[PDB]
Amino acid sequence: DMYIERAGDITWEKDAEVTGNSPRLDVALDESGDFSLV
Amino acid sequence: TTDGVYRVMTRRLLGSTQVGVGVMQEGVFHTMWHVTKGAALRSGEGRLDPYWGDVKQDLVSYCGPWKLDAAWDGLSEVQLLAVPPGERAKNIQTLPGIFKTKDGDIGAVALDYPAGTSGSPILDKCGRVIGLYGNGVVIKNGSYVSAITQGKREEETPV
């Protein structure tokens, strides 16, 4: 039994918490949908 | 099929497990292929049948074709509307990095959430869904970077 349950509206939050860097990565995508680092 | 973000749950004999997340828009449910493995979904007393999908993109839509057409503009911050298992939906803002591929650049977010957060929407400042979270790579120190995965909204199919 795989089922869905609503979890909210989709909105941009003003004054949201910011985090994370912005990495630049060389990757390959294969025919099965896997990303790998080169 | 009211618009919004939804958890994707599985139930066997015991309790339920959240295996992912998806977006309902224009009567179509959008999630990542690895969440459902492209199988049917229940919504209330109704059945949602797979309609379009692509395992390489790791995407699947239910009840109709892929509807989400907004794109990252390549320089603005974005928000992940993370819907983690057992936790309230929350917005996290970030400046994407880049997956550089032989076929072009893909925006990518260095945000690390449980596996069942897969399919959570990534948003632009207008609240448009510019992709879904959860197909990515693990970099050297063990942290995670997700592609901003977006499908193509095709033109109306002839008749």
Ligand SMILES: N=C(N)N[C@@H]1CCCCNC(=O)[C@H](CCCCN)NC(=O)[C@H](CCCCN)NC(=O)Cc2cccc(c2)CNC(=O)CNC1=O
């Ligand atoms: N810090 C981590 N590792 N964080 C993730 C965030 C998932 C976010 C949601 N997305 C996924 O669940 C996908 C599913 C597979 C899609 C394949 N098309 N997965 C991934 O995109 C990566 C891909 C690796 C590259 C494939 N060439 N797979 C993993 O990360 C597997 C992994 C690896 C090491 C350790 C762990 C898991 C243990 N960590 C957890 O148990 C919870 N955290 C995560 O699992």
